[PDB]
Design a binder for this molecule. Structure first.
Ligand code: A1AQN
Ligand code: GUN
Length: 203
């Protein structure tokens, strides 16, 4: 059970996310086997079409744009002042062939609604394809965090240790329409077992 301090620390984590703007994405641009038309029967949640969003610039809702998402696997998100360190890391890894890296689609997961987005007026949940990452990807991410200071992930209770869930987000849907959510998951489940190829760094 969480303590008083832990509960207070969670509020700080959520607010920190809400306050975050202008961060940089350290991720791998990938090619996926699914297309928009595969989800033609699905209704997506796009904050750009919604009202009551209290801060469109917050990274907690800014990227909740239906299925209009560039296919990518996030390694980490950090502050803009780390841009130089990240650029230096890309140069340090210039000899690494990122296109040799591969992920395997395992299971379709609908992440829980982030409290940071909900408090900013969002009503969406992310449907993602959980990926199996090779040791090369895991090592690449660890060394990235060694060269480029990156906020520690805290997706759960503040006391828990983060378990990286490599994933390619497919689309956001309303958190209050189960039929739509389940139909989406079913359709996305058809792509399980597919292999995703890395093209390079997200730019
Ligand atoms: N400059 C940026 N700063 C923070 N996030 C950014 C971003 N550009 C893209 N995103 C995407 O927004 C994330 C949600 O925070 C992730 O999406 P995801 O992997 O699909 S759950 C992330 O990739
Ligand atoms: N990597 C990762 N992202 C998440 N987003 C929401 N929950 C999680 C989680 O457990 N892991």
């Amino acid at each position: 059970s969480a303590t008083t301090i832990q509960k207070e620390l969670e509020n700080i984590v959520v607010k920190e996310r809400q306050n975050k703007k202008d961060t940089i994405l350290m991720g791998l641009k990938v090619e996926v086997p699914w297309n928009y038309c595969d989800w033609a029967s699905i209704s997506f949640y796009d904050v750009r079409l919604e009202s009551g969003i209290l801060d469109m610039e917050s990274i907690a809702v800014k990227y909740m744009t239906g299925c209009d998402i560039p296919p990518h696997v996030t390694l980490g998100i950090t502050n803009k002042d780390q841009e130089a360190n990240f650029q230096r890391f890309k140069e340090l890894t210039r000899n690494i062939d990122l296109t040799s890296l591969s992920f395997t689609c395992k299971e379709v997961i609908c992440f829980p609604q982030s409290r940071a987005s909900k408090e900013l007026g969002a009503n969406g949940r992310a449907v993602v394809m959980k990926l199996e990452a090779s040791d090369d990807v895991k090592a690449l991410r660890n060394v990235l965090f060694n060269v480029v200071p990156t906020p520690r992930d805290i997706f759960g209770p503040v006391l828990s240790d983060p378990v990286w869930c490599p994933h390619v987000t497919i689309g956001y849907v309303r958190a209050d329409d189960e039929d739509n959510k389940n139909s989406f998951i079913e359709l996305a489940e058809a792509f399980r077992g597919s292999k995703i190829k890395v093209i390079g760094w997200c730019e």
